[PDB]
Design a protein around this nucleic acid. Structure first.
Ligand SMILES: [Mg+2]
Ligand SMILES: [Mg+2]
Ligand SMILES: [Mg+2]
Ligand SMILES: [Mg+2]
Ligand SMILES: [Mg+2]
Ligand SMILES: [Mg+2]
Ligand SMILES: [Mg+2]
Ligand SMILES: [Mg+2]
Ligand SMILES: [Mg+2]
Ligand SMILES: [Mg+2]
Ligand SMILES: [Mg+2]
Ligand SMILES: [Mg+2]
Ligand SMILES: [Mg+2]
Ligand SMILES: [Mg+2]
Ligand SMILES: [Mg+2]
Ligand SMILES: [Mg+2]
Ligand SMILES: [Mg+2]
Ligand SMILES: [Mg+2]
Ligand SMILES: [Mg+2]
Ligand SMILES: [Mg+2]
Ligand SMILES: [Mg+2]
Ligand SMILES: [Mg+2]
Ligand SMILES: [Mg+2]
Ligand SMILES: [Mg+2]
Ligand SMILES: [Mg+2]
Lengths: 50, 53, 187, 124, 181
RNA sequence: GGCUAAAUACCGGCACGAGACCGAUAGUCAACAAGUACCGUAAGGGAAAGUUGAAAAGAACUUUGAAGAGAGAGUUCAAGAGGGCGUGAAACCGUUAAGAGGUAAACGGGUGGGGUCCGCGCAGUCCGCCCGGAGGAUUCAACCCGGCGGCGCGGUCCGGC
RNA sequence: UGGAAUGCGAGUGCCUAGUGGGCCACUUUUGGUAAGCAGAACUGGCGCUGCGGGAUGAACCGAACGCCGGGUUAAGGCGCC
């Protein structure tokens, strides 16, 4: 894992495969998700998912 | 010329003599050294000076 | 696999005295209970220092104890040092102190007692001050050792006032080149 | 003191057995033969010991008198109880609880007395 | 003295053995395997043929380089030889064993070679001189032999031409006996 | 120009004492007919090698063989200690017994089959209380006498250190 | 109103071994016709490291490893082996 992706994945707290977290979206966080784009699957969860 | 001999400070040597005598007045420590002192009347055991002769 | 480093998992710190002294460990048993079963942080600090090594338990001089116990508001408090209270001949008058220490030098006992003071042992402090109330915890100087003269930037670097390791001290012992501009250079 | 003396013998004693991942103490007045502070039969001012009678009838209860701690000859009081099984235990239970003489050894003494008495029955 | 095996019925068996015998161990191990289980009269008759080259000893284990012969076909084997010293040494041990049977009052005509074992004995040292001023071992390979004979229900009387032979007198044995007497 | 004891040194010599030393490939090269045997013209170089048994009681006598070797017998607690003999390992070999065998053998994991033996197995635990049937007593509680023991803020008993 | 988001306990001092032949891949890149060639930047790897796939293979793809049961997957596959 490249050094920048590795740091952003630890900040999201996704230090292990198939780990999940909620993230509240904004310019600061959407641009972080772009960096780890090859390493994550993300989307908008509905109430039942939560 | 291996170093066979050890210097021990005088104060620490006297400490050891003091701790050995203090531990010799306790039945538990004397018992735990394996001595059969279950019937000696007292500890420390003092006997009159006649025996020196 | 989890992405984490393991080089800092194990914290380096004493959990008990390296010393095998049985009286030290009886105090550690005593203050293990007090530190655990009371909300006092003084008990926790004392417990920690009973583990500390000899060089982490510097001796406290008599003069320094008097100086710190003379500050305003510290009247009738117990001076507590986890270490040895040495004597300071440079002092003239010793006031009436109440101290608790692991050791007190023979000549410092006579001076403290002759002035009306009291010398406790850490088992007596627990009965007197179970939570450490009314105390003044004191420490000896930790950098008061010849070794700390030799630590820091290497002596041969600019503005490095470190003490070198020389077998003998004199004009012929590491003073020519690198210590004066006349011989090569100085820094 | 007891705690000081335990710190000297906890691992250095002629009565200490360390074998097969087990630790035992063979001194008298140890109700479980256990290398323990509670059950050590030497370091406490008061101790309780249960032994079989010199003849295989009954048990001998040993209690440490209060006064002569430094006088081994007169330190221990021996009492021989040769009653029936339930009566023997009742005496031991009372000698401990009623006197408040090491109340924490009550069941250890009672379990030891039963084991000695049970041993003295004919072997089948 | 202990033998590797034990007789099943000791009252019906005779023993013989020899040690440090200067006959090749390899030739003799093969020779003994041939007569294992043989009736003594058959066994004695067989070893005399081996001396006369009328019957071969098949070399089954120690056969490296041993030649082929038509008499090894008797044994379901292609390789056979005629070790004369091995046969002669075993004929002496059998003769000793047969005398042991007589001393015990056993029917010698019913004996079978039940157990027979050839062991390596300590090796005797000589040397041979090689090119470039070198010396190499020249080792004899002696053997220990032990055989147990047992009685079975098959009887073979001894050959007529063998029982009629004269009890050979040895002059040198007479000399020593006279000197002792 | 000159003499002069003592306190100091001592891996040679004579005679001793001791050891947290080594224990027959160790310790001296040398535990033994070892500076020997043996090698080299010479100067020199230089080994291997301890152990039956308490006691030789060291196997008489018979028998096969020319003999070496055997079979019996005998001594001994034991020759299953037989004169380079205490014990007697491994490698290597003989034989016996069991198993198996055309991808050299060997090996890890998982079973299965067969043996060697082990459980010193084969109607399957022990303990407490209580119910009931049958019995038998150095027979229970409570009181009396005597001894010992624990504790007592004996709200403040006397005497002691 | 500890003055963006996110995550996370930090600071500090002594003593210190091995190492100081490296090599490989995407991208960038010098010399050379080129080289499984020589020389650089970045990151990641092998070296030090097994494991699933690439039949086989230091480095490729997936994924990193205490001893196990069940379930599901990755990269790869599903004629038979
Ligand atoms: Mg893990
Ligand atoms: Mg690690
Ligand atoms: Mg670390
Ligand atoms: Mg060939
Ligand atoms: Mg040829
Ligand atoms: Mg020549
Ligand atoms: Mg002179
Ligand atoms: Mg030797
Ligand atoms: Mg030697
Ligand atoms: Mg040897
Ligand atoms: Mg040895
Ligand atoms: Mg030698
Ligand atoms: Mg030997
Ligand atoms: Mg002997
Ligand atoms: Mg024997
Ligand atoms: Mg023997
Ligand atoms: Mg030997
Ligand atoms: Mg032997
Ligand atoms: Mg077979
Ligand atoms: Mg390159
Ligand atoms: Mg390397
Ligand atoms: Mg690494
Ligand atoms: Mg890897
Ligand atoms: Mg391929
Ligand atoms: Mg699984």
């Amino acid at each position: 894992v490249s050094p920048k992706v590795r740091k952003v994945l630890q900040l999201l707290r996704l230090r292990q495969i198939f780990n999940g977290t909620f993230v509240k979206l904004n310019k600061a966080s959407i641009n972080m998700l772009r960096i780890v784009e090859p390493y994550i699957a993300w989307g908008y969860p509905n109430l039942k998912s939560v | 010329w291996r170093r066979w001999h050890r210097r021990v400070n005088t104060t620490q040597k006297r400490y050891a003599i003091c701790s050995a005598l203090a531990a010799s007045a306790l039945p538990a420590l004397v018992m735990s050294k394996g001595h059969r002192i279950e019937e000696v009347p007292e500890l420390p055991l003092v006997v009159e000076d006649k025996v020196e002769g | 696999g989890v992405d984490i480093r393991h080089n800092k998992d194990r914290k380096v710190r004493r959990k008990e005295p390296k010393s095998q002294d049985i009286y030290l460990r009886l105090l550690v048993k005593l203050y293990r209970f007090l530190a655990r079963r009371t909300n006092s942080t003084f008990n926790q600090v004392v417990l920690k220092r009973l583990f500390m090594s000899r060089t982490n338990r510097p001796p406290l001089s008599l003069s320094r104890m008097i100086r710190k116990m003379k500050l305003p508001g510290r009247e009738n408090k117990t001076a507590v040092v986890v270490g040895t209270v040495t004597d300071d001949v440079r002092v003239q008058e010793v006031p009436k102190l109440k101290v608790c220490a692991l050791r007190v030098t023979s000549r410092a006992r006579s001076r403290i007692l002759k002035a009306g003071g009291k010398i406790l042992t850490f088992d007596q402090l627990a009965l007197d001050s179970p939570k450490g109330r009314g105390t003044v915890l004191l420490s000896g100087p930790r950098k008061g050792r010849e070794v700390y003269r030799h630590f820091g930037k290497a002596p041969g670097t600019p503005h490095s006032h470190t003490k070198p390791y020389v077998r003998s001290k004199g004009r012929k012992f590491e003073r020519a080149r690198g210590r004066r501009a006349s011989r090569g250079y100085k820094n | 003191s007891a705690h000081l003396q335990w710190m000297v013998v906890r691992n250095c004693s002629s009565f200490l057995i360390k074998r097969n991942k087990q630790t035992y103490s063979t001194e008298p007045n140890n109700l479980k033969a256990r290398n323990s502070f509670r059950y050590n039969g030497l370091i406490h001012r008061k101790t309780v010991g249960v032994e079989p009678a010199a003849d295989g009838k009954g048990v001998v209860v040993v209690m440490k008198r209060r006064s002569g701690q430094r006088k081994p000859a007169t330190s221990y009081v021996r009492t021989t109880i040769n009653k029936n099984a339930r009566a023997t235990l009742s005496s031991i239970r009372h000698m401990i609880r009623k006197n408040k003489y090491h109340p924490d050894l009550r069941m250890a003494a009672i379990r030891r007395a039963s084991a000695i008495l049970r041993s003295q029955k004919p072997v089948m | 003295v202990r033998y590797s095996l034990d007789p099943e019925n000791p009252t019906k068996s005779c023993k013989s053995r020899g040690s440090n015998l200067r006959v090749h161990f390899k030739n003799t191990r093969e020779t003994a395997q041939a007569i294992k289980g043989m009736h003594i009269r058959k066994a004695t008759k067989y070893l005399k043929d081996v001396t006369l080259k009328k019957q071969c000893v098949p070399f089954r284990r120690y056969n490296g380089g041993v030649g082929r012969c038509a008499q090894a076909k008797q044994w379901g084997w292609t390789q056979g030889r005629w070790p004369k010293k091995s046969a002669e040494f075993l004929l002496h041990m059998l003769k000793n064993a047969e005398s042991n049977a007589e001393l015990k009052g056993l029917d010698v005509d019913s004996l079978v070679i039940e157990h027979i074992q050839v062991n390596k004995a300590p090796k005797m040292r000589r040397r041979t001189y090689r090119a470039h001023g070198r010396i190499n071992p020249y080792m004899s390979s002696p053997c220990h032999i032990e055989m147990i004979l047992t009685e079975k229900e098959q009887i073979v009387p001894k050959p007529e031409e063998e029982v009629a032979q004269k009890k050979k007198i040895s002059q040198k044995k007479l000399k020593k006996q006279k000197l002792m007497a």
